[PDB]
Design a protein around this motif. Structure first.
Motif, PDB file in Angstrom:
ATOM      1  N   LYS A 167      44.021  56.859  41.541  1.00 19.03           N
ATOM      2  CA  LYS A 167      45.287  55.908  40.906  1.00 19.03           C
ATOM      3  C   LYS A 167      44.844  54.557  40.464  1.00 19.03           C
ATOM      4  N   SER A 168      43.566  54.643  40.172  1.00 22.09           N
ATOM      5  CA  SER A 168      43.151  53.240  39.382  1.00 22.09           C
ATOM      6  C   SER A 168      43.532  53.183  38.296  1.00 22.09           C
TER       7      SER A 168
ATOM      8  N   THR B  94      40.974  49.088  47.258  1.00 23.89           N
ATOM      9  CA  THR B  94      40.627  48.324  47.281  1.00 23.89           C
ATOM     10  C   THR B  94      38.951  47.859  47.548  1.00 23.89           C
ATOM     11  N   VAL B  95      38.137  47.823  46.220  1.00 22.28           N
ATOM     12  CA  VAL B  95      36.734  48.125  46.771  1.00 22.28           C
ATOM     13  C   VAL B  95      36.286  46.861  46.509  1.00 22.28           C
TER      14      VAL B  95
ATOM     15  N   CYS C 145      33.773  49.302  34.955  1.00 25.89           N
ATOM     16  CA  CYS C 145      33.446  48.608  35.972  1.00 25.89           C
ATOM     17  C   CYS C 145      33.585  49.255  37.504  1.00 25.89           C
ATOM     18  N   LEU C 146      35.344  49.814  37.531  1.00 28.18           N
ATOM     19  CA  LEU C 146      34.807  50.049  38.781  1.00 28.18           C
ATOM     20  C   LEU C 146      35.213  51.618  38.883  1.00 28.18           C
TER      21      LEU C 146
ATOM     22  N   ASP D  22      44.014  42.613  37.994  1.00 27.39           N
ATOM     23  CA  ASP D  22      43.999  42.729  39.055  1.00 27.39           C
ATOM     24  C   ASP D  22      42.979  43.591  40.184  1.00 27.39           C
ATOM     25  N   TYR D  23      42.300  44.950  40.414  1.00 30.36           N
ATOM     26  CA  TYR D  23      41.310  44.981  40.845  1.00 30.36           C
ATOM     27  C   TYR D  23      39.683  43.877  40.572  1.00 30.36           C
ATOM     28  N   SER D  24      39.675  43.179  39.571  1.00 32.56           N
ATOM     29  CA  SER D  24      38.742  42.223  39.120  1.00 32.56           C
ATOM     30  C   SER D  24      38.937  41.066  40.006  1.00 32.56           C
TER      31      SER D  24
END
Lengths: 480, 506, 529, 525
Positions: free
Chosen positions: A66-67, C46-47, A466-467, C371-373
């Motif tokens: 999904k990311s 959210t990680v 990175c994620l 965003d997630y960053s």
């Protein structure tokens, strides 16, 4: 609920999340790319080559994939230009991190250290293969739009279609005198009305008001149309607005609603043409340019569907800022008009990135081969623990042109073996031909892209991984 | 995988806690009900592990070692499973550390290698203490009475079993020759010294009172031949139209069995023995001639006739000669619980002495047989090689602190495993104090300072609820007990840590 | 509404289930750890490395483990950080406390053995305590900042933030509690934008409001010094009534819209230089702002304007009114700032308020990839500024990276022999439990654990081994860790330190919370009817 | 579709378990069959024999390990390990779509070059093959192929038994005699591992039920092998007794008793104190032997009697009669003795006469550990077959360091032969790094630092000089392995030329066998 994965199961499930999707998008690359079909919950289908709507409609059971859609939205908002050759790079990384992850028992942070060092050397390669060109020549941007429209037959109409957007490009620009050519093209809206021909589109330097005048047979010329930012009720109230503007003696009228019969008496005595209600967003277009003055000429046209109004300032200053305008798109048919909008709407970001970085990076798979060689050269020099992971990054950029070769169905080994010499040693303009599937000069054949295309993509693509390397445990099925 | 190893360790933790009442004389009994309806109740940690039923496959490691420790020591062997169980429990956080299971197995390998060197130094020759041939085995037999359920009735066997083991030839020792017969019912003080073969009771029909039960000097004769009329005779074709020739079918064997019993009696044997059962035809013949006969000689009864009695077995009646017959000084048949026991006595040629164990409890009478059998194995290896170590569980504590001295010579990453093996060795006296109700920390702090000063042998006797020396209390242990205990337990710990996965089919 | 469970199961099944959950979060300990993915079931996740966020969304069916989750709530109030690192110390406390209660000693003697040890543990920390003083420049505040930047993925980018956070906290410096340096929480405004990089952030010694002007044709900059600013909550928005003449209702709305039109006209009567309106404003009322050189702002958040009245010192007003019934704007609601400069970062203007009066404030505008960053960078600097807050409030700081747990070994070993009795065994287990924290770091470092642990014992033993009053060196104190080369390096050369509050009033509060679990005898669960 | 999913997923299931089955760090595993019998062994090749396998591709690789036991059988678990790594490298090529024909040609061209490089790895051929001094270099590393608990006892018993269990001659050429049964495996629970020794006699498990009097001093025993049981001649069918008069009824029992008496007396006339009987013994025989005191032998079917053919040297004779000295063997002493705590029949010969065979007593507490010792005994016979059958076994660097140098040689072979297969050979040239990867995983070492140090220690050949250090270099298994790369010759760690010659030759065709399967067609039951 748990849904937690620990040990080797955590890494295997997250890699295979976007691995199966990476093989599905392999047909989305190049001018020979296929067209993917989608299935919504309503049973309908959408046939398009844009990967933005493909990943949105497809529901993946793994949350890790999904990311990639959110990572794709970042590249679409920042660039959003030529997703056929761009957005596919989002899935070419995790697929190449599979061979050594668990097998060598290397901790992901060790791979993260190699990921940070790969971005440092990648920024120097992007601007190394780029070459500057004349930024004031509009003929160079004409052949650039023609490269991304090759998915359709619009090349015959490309003469009018390219000049349609490029007339608005040079019209806006100018957000700064010096330090960079920032602009905003969102103020220019493209209206699509089925029927007619593309030549019916009227675009030039100025503010295009799309509306009609009082009467279609009214005089079509105004000396200086200075711009300014049931029956009984309409004639009294509107007269208190349009006629009140005449205090500074403008020859141009802008109202929210139409003009009644009583207002026509005092509006026409000024010796000019009276303009009735103007579109709401058109007031924001002229608000950027300019009580406005120095308007050169006015013109009005007549055609069945809707009418036209021409407003030419012709002198912004007396510095100043960008100008806004309007564009109407008239297609040949209903199904033809809606499909061609993807190439014309993206033409705004095509020339927008040219103003940002006049330098030009080689396209058609030449950029990915240039980076793959530089990453392979710095691998043997650095050595250390980064030897294995940083070398696999070079193979990640090597598989991107392999996807372009997949459209032809040949052996990439034959082509890539020759690209390690004529490209790295010879020149950065060497690449893979899209039409013939051979090795030809990209600049001579006409395949090239602005530096911002490759710069804002590869840099975002490297940072997007990175994620993927930070994943440890997954927790779901609770609340938010 | 990694979780399979921890699952195998946790499966043995429940067994370690279950074996706490086993080891030590101050422990408690455990009831094990098998499929034979016989409940196993014993205070000794050997017999319990023999019939113990397990479930998880990893528990077979404790089952396989239970059969090996029985052939070596036979009593107080639970410490083998206690050490192997505690090392796996202490190594649970160590498996998650950077030390691989191999360095842990190599740590136990070097720990047992340095322990044998310490046991050899701690071995003390008892002959230098001016111990005669009596006090040597007597003090060793009294201290061997521990680990057994009934201490009171064990005092009655102290002055007896010593003379019973010494009755056996010291040059050649055999467990089957010294084998002891169990008698159900009766007090524990009712036992006797028997020099000859014993029978269950007898199998007889009608009147059994016409046979004299006591003879003066009978000739012992054991035979495997069966006496019966037309038993194994195969089907034959007999055509007889006459009378006597048809009647001679039964009369031939009736006259033949009369000649068989006559030729055996002419040899002078007053005791006739048979293997397979016999009929009642010989009753009238034996009653008039005052000759006793008993059949169904068991396997253990045959081995006693071979060595102790020294007789022979001859099936052919005409081939029986006086050279195949035995003798004895006195034949006495004692009756207990309406059951007569044929007992051979007065046999100078007999090199063994059979004991008669009489007890009321079925669970105790099964332990007493193995209780005296354990002392036989103790007197066996101790007589050949004389080595004395202090019993009661304080032998490992002398080594426990000494293991910390070798850790100072290591000076490396394996020192944490050596320190763990020395700390996990102290769980044995703590479980002995748990069954005694003593404090764990208070005694352990005294156990560490015990060997810290005097060293040598300091036993910390648990009977007086005080600290002391078991050597001064005449509490002894065979040195070969802990030698085979530490050597065998090391391979048991190396087998568990070496199995990363368990595969089960069907 | 259910049955009860007693016996050794409460001392085991409740403890082992807590250990199973505790072993999960151990993967996030230290900068060498990893981050957990928290899925929202809506398609986004959210990680984060924050322990308070993970344990909150994690499903826990055991009430015994819910107490450890609530520790992060009270820890962030007193400390403000440690959810990525320090919170792990509450895990292993029950690991070695289980093995002791399963044999003989009652938990009372074990807990009272911890009480007498914890009472002297504060003094044992004070012996190894190194006060903050005699340091060159900002090296102290920079090292504390870099330590707060640890455990975060942006820790590599901290070469910039380390210098910015120090100066940002000096901007919010105020005086309260009778002459004591205070750094009010939330006074630092964190803004997010997409572009540039992490090192491109701007240091603003004042408040920054993220918003755009009402009308796009309004002046984008207001020059001059000593510019006034005010915050207004005024709202601009569109019973038995017998309708006869439409002019009656038209006259009513004409007066309503007329007075509201006058409400904006009464603002310029007091000389307001800058007007901040909570709600929207029509384009007609914006003409008075252009002629008076006023910069209008509409659609403001109540929490955004509340921080302005606190920092700048202006008085917030709901609408036009005074002590009388007349609706007007008094001049007493006007604030003061040094200058008004509009900074445009990624198509977003910012109102710069410098030279605040009531409370000194600062702002930090973060620009990043996506965003997630940036969403992760929010919690990164949220707990980072609280670390230096306790550093300048109390100059006592303790070494990090497993140095405290390695030093307390001999302190607790010699203290266990002093008390003796049955508490000597419990104290030895409390010292060996704290050594698990550096062992967990080696798990995520892909190196040998006991190899460093044997060095943590050996190199830290020279302190108490040799007489410290005789000097003789042989002891560099801290040592304690290296996260790259896998070697023994002093913390002074490495530059990693943490306040004493990270240990005192942290483990002291966690130990008293964990001993309550050992006190639990039975368990009663009542299902909802 | 079968190779992408079914073939890769099924083989990698057991491939992860085989990583602990190779090297001196090899780990045992517990496998319970359908019958319920538990099996613990550290050899994966032994596992696959008793393991139930469904997917056919794994069953094909099982037969490759069975052929290794016929030739080498020493450290042959790499066949499962190497094939798994070759499929991993091929898995990258399967996703790319590379033709399977070029893959088969990659192993064929590499096999011809690999066999030529093995002839350059031979150093210091041992031609003695007799004394323990020269065999210590060969036997000691073979002991490391199994459990490392005691490497001193296992290496000493094999080196000592040479002059005992193996045929002894001045100069023995032309494939000297060797047998797997030359060493009997006797598993007796109890006793320390150090109590195991080599005995020139023979031990059987049974208890004589008679009056037996052991003759020790005088020795001189006569023993013979009897095919038929000891009794009068018996009818194989079922006859019918014929009784008419009293003479046939009374003398019916006396007929069978008197004939066996004279039949058994002829055996006693030759001074026969013991016999070898493949069948049972009747009750009438044991009763008459009580006077003579002649032994009987209850041993099972001839599979055990095959060992007695060399020991006694007697030909089985069905008829009893008076066996000639050709059928009469020789044994020095026959006595029932207690070795591991049990009383069994033991032939104890101080100085005996025995032909090309002997026994080795095994003393251990755990019977499951004795199962691995039996496999270690087969490695001793495998070491003999490795020396005897070929002209020589030479020497090879051990500890899995053989293919480390072979990677640099094969990598050059791909560069020296340009073409389309140049990249295919390089993918198969570095595929041999799994051997140090497999051992270091069980050695507690991180392959990230260690593996490039192994290439940095060997380099190309050496620095400028005339010498070879790399032949003496290998991975270190020890607590000091964190310090650096330990040598081998100092500890005399060697390998055999035929070990890697036969393994790679079979693994070459075994790797291409799985990759040649387009689809797997199955059926019910």
């Amino acid at each position: 609920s748990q849904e937690r994965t620990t040990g080797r199961q955590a890494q295997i499930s997250n890699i295979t999340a976007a691995k199966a999707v990476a093989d599905v998008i392999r047909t989305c690359l190049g001018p020979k790319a296929m067209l993917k079909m989608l299935l919504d919950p309503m049973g309908g289908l959408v046939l398009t080559n844009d990967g933005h709507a493909i990943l949105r409609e497809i529901d993946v059971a793994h949350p890790a994939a999904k990311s990639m859609l959110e990572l794709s939205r970042t590249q679409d908002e920042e660039v959003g230009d030529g997703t056929t050759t761009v957005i596919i790079l989002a899935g070419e990384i995790l697929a190449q991190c599979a061979p050594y992850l668990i097998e060598k028992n290397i901790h992901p942070v060790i791979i993260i250290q190699a990921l940070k060092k790969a971005l440092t050397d990648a920024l120097e390669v992007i601007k190394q293969v780029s070459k500057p060109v004349d930024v004031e020549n509009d003929a160079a941007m004409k052949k650039l739009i023609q490269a991304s429209i090759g998915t359709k037959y619009v090349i015959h109409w490309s003469e009018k279609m390219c000049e349609l957007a490029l007339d608005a490009v040079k019209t806006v620009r100018k957000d700064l005198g010096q330090t960079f050519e920032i602009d905003i093209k969102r103020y220019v809206r493209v209206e699509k009305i089925p029927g007619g021909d593309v030549l019916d589109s009227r675009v030039l330097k100025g503010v295009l008001l799309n509306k009609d005048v009082v009467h279609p047979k009214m005089s079509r010329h105004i000396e200086n149309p200075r711009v300014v930012l049931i029956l009984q009720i309409e004639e009294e109230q509107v007269q208190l607005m349009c006629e009140q503007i005449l205090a500074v003696r403008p020859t141009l009228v802008i109202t929210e609603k139409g003009v009644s019969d009583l207002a026509q008496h005092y509006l026409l005595k000024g010796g000019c043409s009276v303009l009735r209600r103007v579109k709401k967003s058109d007031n924001n277009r002229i608000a950027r340019v300019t009580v406005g003055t120095n308007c050169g000429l006015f013109k009005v046209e007549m055609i069945g569907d809707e009418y036209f109004s021409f407003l030419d300032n012709c002198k912004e200053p007396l510095s100043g800022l960008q100008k806004a305008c309007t564009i109407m798109l008239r297609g040949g048919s209903k199904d033809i008009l809606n499909e061609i909008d993807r190439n014309l709407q993206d033409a705004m970001a095509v020339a927008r990135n040219v103003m940002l970085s006049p330098s030009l990076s080689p396209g058609g798979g030449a950029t990915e081969m240039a980076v793959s060689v530089k990453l392979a050269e710095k691998a043997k020099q650095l050595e250390g623990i980064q030897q294995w992971p940083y070398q696999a990054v070079a193979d990640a950029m090597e598989c991107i042109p392999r996807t372009l070769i997949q459209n032809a169905g040949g052996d990439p080994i034959r082509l890539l073996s020759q690209l390690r010499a004529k490209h790295a040693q010879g020149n950065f303009t060497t690449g893979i031909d899209g039409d013939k599937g051979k090795i030809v000069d990209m600049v001579s054949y006409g395949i090239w892209e602005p530096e911002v295309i490759k710069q804002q993509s590869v840099k975002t693509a490297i940072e997007s991984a990175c994620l993927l390397l930070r994943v440890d445990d997954i927790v779901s099925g609770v609340r938010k | 995988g990694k979780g399979q190893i921890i699952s195998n360790i946790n499966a043995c933790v429940a067994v370690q806690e279950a074996l706490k009442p086993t080891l030590g004389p101050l422990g408690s009994d455990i009831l094990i009900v098998t499929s034979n309806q016989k409940t196993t109740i014993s205070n000794d940690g050997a017999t319990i592990l023999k019939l113990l039923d397990v479930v998880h496959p990893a528990a077979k490691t404790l089952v396989d070692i239970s059969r090996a420790q029985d052939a070596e020591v036979g009593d107080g062997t639970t410490s083998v499973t206690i050490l192997a169980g505690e090392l796996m429990k202490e190594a649970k956080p160590f498996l998650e550390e950077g030390i691989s299971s191999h360095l842990i197995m190599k740590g136990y390998r070097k720990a047992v290698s340095l322990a044998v060197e310490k046991i050899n130094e701690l071995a003390v020759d008892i002959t230098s203490e001016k111990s005669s041939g009596r006090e040597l085995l007597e003090r060793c037999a009294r201290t061997a009475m521990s680990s057994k359920l009934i201490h009171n009735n064990a005092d009655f066997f102290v002055k007896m079993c010593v003379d019973a083991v010494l009755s056996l030839d010291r040059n050649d020792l055999d467990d089957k020759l010294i084998g002891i017969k169990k008698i159900p019912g009766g007090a524990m003080e009712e036992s006797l010294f028997i020099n000859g073969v014993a029978f269950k009771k007898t199998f007889s029909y009608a009147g059994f009172e016409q046979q004299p039960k006591k003879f003066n000097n009978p000739k012992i004769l054991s035979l495997n031949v069966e006496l019966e009329l037309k038993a194994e005779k195969d089907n034959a074709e007999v055509r007889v139209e006459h009378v006597e020739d048809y009647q001679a079918i039964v009369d031939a064997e009736w006259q033949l069995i009369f000649e068989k019993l006559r030729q055996v009696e002419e040899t002078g044997a007053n005791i006739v023995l048979s293997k397979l059962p016999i009929g009642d035809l010989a009753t009238q013949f034996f009653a008039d001639r005052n000759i006793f006969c008993a059949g169904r000689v068991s396997a253990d009864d045959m081995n006693r006739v071979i060595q102790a009695v020294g007789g022979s077995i001859q099936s052919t009646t005409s081939d029986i000669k006086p050279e195949h017959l035995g003798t004895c000084a006195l034949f006495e048949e004692m009756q207990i619980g309406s059951e007569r026991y044929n007992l051979f006595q007065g046999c100078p040629q007999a090199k063994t002495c059979t004991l008669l164990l009489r007890g009321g409890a079925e669970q105790v009478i099964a332990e007493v047989e193995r209780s005296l059998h354990d002392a036989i194995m103790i007197v066996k290896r101790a007589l050949q090689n004389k080595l004395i170590v202090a019993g009661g569980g304080a032998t490992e504590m002398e080594v426990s602190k000494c293991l910390r001295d070798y850790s100072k010579t290591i000076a490396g990453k394996q020192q944490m495993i050596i320190n763990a093996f020395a700390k996990a060795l102290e769980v044995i006296p703590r479980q002995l104090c748990e069954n005694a109700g003593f404090d764990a920390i208070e005694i352990l702090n005294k156990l560490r300072l015990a060997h810290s000063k005097g060293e040598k042998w300091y036993g910390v006797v648990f009977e007086t609820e005080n600290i002391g020396d078991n050597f001064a209390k005449f509490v002894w242990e065979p040195a070969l007990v802990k030698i085979n205990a530490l050597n065998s337990a090391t391979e048991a710990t190396n087998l568990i840590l070496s199995v990363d996965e368990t595969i089960t089919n069907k | 509404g259910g049955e009860k469970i007693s016996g050794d199961d409460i001392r085991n099944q409740n403890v082992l289930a807590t250990m199973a959950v505790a072993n999960v979060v151990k993967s996030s300990l230290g900068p060498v750890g990893l981050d957990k993915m928290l899925v929202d079931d809506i398609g986004d996740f959210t990680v984060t490395n924050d322990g308070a966020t993970i344990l909150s969304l994690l499903d826990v069916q055991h009430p015994a483990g819910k107490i450890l989750v609530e520790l992060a709530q009270q820890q962030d109030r007193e400390i403000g950080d440690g959810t990525t690192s320090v919170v792990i110390i509450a895990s292993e406390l029950l690991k070695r406390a289980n093995e002791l209660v399963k044999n003989k000693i009652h938990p009372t003697t074990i807990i009272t053995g911890f009480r007498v040890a914890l009472r002297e543990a504060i003094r044992f920390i004070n012996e190894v305590l190194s006060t903050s003083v005699d340091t060159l420049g900002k090296e102290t505040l920079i090292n504390i900042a870099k330590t707060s930047m640890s455990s975060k993925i942006i820790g590599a980018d901290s070469d910039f933030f380390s210098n910015m956070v120090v100066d940002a906290l000096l901007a919010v410096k105020t005086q309260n509690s009778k002459g004591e340096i205070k750094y009010p929480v939330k006074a630092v405004n964190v803004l997010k934008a997409h572009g540039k990089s992490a090192t491109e952030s701007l240091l603003v010694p004042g408040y920054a409001l993220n918003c755009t002007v009402a009308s796009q044709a309004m002046p984008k900059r207001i020059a001059g010094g000593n510019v006034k600013i005010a915050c207004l909550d005024l709202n601009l928005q569109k019973v038995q009534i017998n309708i006869d003449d439409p002019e009656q209702l038209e006259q009513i709305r004409k007066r309503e819209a007329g007075i509201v039109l006058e409400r904006v006209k009464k603002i310029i009567d007091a000389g307001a230089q800058v007007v901040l309106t909570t709600k929207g404003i029509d384009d007609l009322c914006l003409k008075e702002f252009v002629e008076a050189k006023i910069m209008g702002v509409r659609r403001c958040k109540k929490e955004d304007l509340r921080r302005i009245a606190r920092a700048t010192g202006a008085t917030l007003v709901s609408s036009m009114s005074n002590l009388e019934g007349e609706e007007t704007f008094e001049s007493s609601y006007l604030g003061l700032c040094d200058e008004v400069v509009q900074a445009k970062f990624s198509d977003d203007e910012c109102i710069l308020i410098k030279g605040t009066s009531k409370h000194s404030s600062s702002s930090i505008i973060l620009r990043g990839a996506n965003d997630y960053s940036l969403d992760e960078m929010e919690r990164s600097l949220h707990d980072s500024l609280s670390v230096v807050k306790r550093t300048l409030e109390s100059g006592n700081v303790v070494p990090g990276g497993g140095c405290v747990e390695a030093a307390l070994n001999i302190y607790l070993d010699n203290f266990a022999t002093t008390v003796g009795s049955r508490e000597q065994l419990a104290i030895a287990e409390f010292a060996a439990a704290l050594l698990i924290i550096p062992k967990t770091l080696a798990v995520n470092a892909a190196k040998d654990s006991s190899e460093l642990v044997a060095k943590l014992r050996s190199y830290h033993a020279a302190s108490q081994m040799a007489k410290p009053e005789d000097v003789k060196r042989r002891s560099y104190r801290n040592y304690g860790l290296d996260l790259i080369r896998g070697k023994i390096v002093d913390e002074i050369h490495a530059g990693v330190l943490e306040p004493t509050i990270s240990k005192v009033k942290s483990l002291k509060s966690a130990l008293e919370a964990c001993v309550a679990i050992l006190r639990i005898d039975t368990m009663i669960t009542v299902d909802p009817e | 579709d079968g190779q992408i999913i079914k073939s890769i997923a099924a083989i990698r299931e057991l491939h992860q378990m085989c990583l602990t089955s190779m090297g001196p760090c090899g780990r045992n595993k517990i496998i319970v069959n359908h019958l319920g019998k538990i099996i613990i062994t550290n050899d994966a090749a032994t596992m696959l024999r008793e393991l139930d396998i469904v997917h056919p591709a794994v069953k094909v690789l099982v037969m490759a390990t069975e052929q290794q036991k016929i030739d080498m059988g020493d450290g042959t678990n790499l066949v499962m390990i190497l094939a798994g790594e070759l499929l991993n490298v091929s898995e990258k090529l399967i996703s790319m779509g590379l033709s399977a024909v070029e893959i088969i040609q990659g192993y064929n061209m590499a096999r011809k070059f690999t066999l030529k490089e093995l002839d350059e790895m031979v150093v210091g051929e041992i031609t003695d093959k007799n004394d323990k001094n020269e065999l210590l270099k060969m036997i000691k590393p073979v002991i490391s192929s199994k459990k490392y608990g005691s490497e001193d006892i296992l290496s000493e018993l094999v080196s000592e038994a040479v002059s005992h269990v193996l045929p002894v001659a001045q100069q023995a050429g032309e494939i000297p005699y060797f047998n797997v049964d030359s060493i009997r495996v006797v598993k007796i629970m109890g006793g320390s591992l150090s109590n195991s020794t080599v005995i020139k006699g023979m031990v059987f498990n049974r208890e004589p039920e008679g009056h037996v009097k052991s003759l020790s001093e005088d020795k001189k025993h006569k023993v013979a092998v009897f095919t038929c049981p000891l009794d009068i001649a018996n009818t194989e069918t079922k006859g019918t007794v014929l009784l008419h008069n009293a003479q046939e009824m009374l003398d019916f029992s006396k007929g069978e008793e008197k004939q066996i008496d004279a039949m058994m007396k002829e055996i006693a006339d030759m001074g026969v104190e013991c016999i070898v009987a493949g069948a049972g013994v009747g009750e009438l025989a044991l009763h008459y032997l009580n006077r003579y005191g002649i032994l009987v032998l209850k041993v099972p079917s001839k599979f055990e009697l095959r060992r007695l053919c060399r020991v006694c040297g007697a030909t089985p004779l069905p008829r009893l009669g008076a066996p000639t000295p050709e059928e009469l063997g020789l044994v020095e002493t026959v006595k029932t003795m207690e070795i591991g705590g049990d009383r069994v029949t033991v032939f104890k010969q101080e100085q005996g006469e025995i032909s090309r065979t002997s026994t080795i007593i095994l003393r251990g507490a755990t019977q499951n550990n004795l199962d691995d010792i039996e496999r270690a005994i087969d490695d001793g016979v495998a070491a003999v077959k490795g020396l005897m059958k070929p002209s020589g076994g030479k020497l090879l660097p051990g500890a899995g360091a053989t293919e480390i140098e072979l990677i640099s040689r094969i990598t050059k072979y791909g560069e020296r032969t340009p073409g389309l297969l140049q990249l295919a050979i390089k993918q198969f040239a570095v595929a041999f790094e799994v051997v140090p990867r497999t051992l270091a995983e069980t050695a507690g070492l991180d392959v990230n630092e260690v593996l490039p140090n192994l290439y940095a220690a060997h380099n190309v050949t050496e620095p400028g000089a005339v010498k070879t250090d790399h032949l003496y270099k290998g991975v270190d298994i020890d607590g000091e392995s964190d310090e650096g790369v330990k040598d081998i010759r100092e500890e005399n760690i060697y390998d055999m030329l035929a070990t890697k010659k036969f393994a790679i030759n079979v693994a070459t065709e075994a790797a291409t066998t799985v990759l040649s399967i387009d689809q797997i067609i199955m059926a019910k039951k």
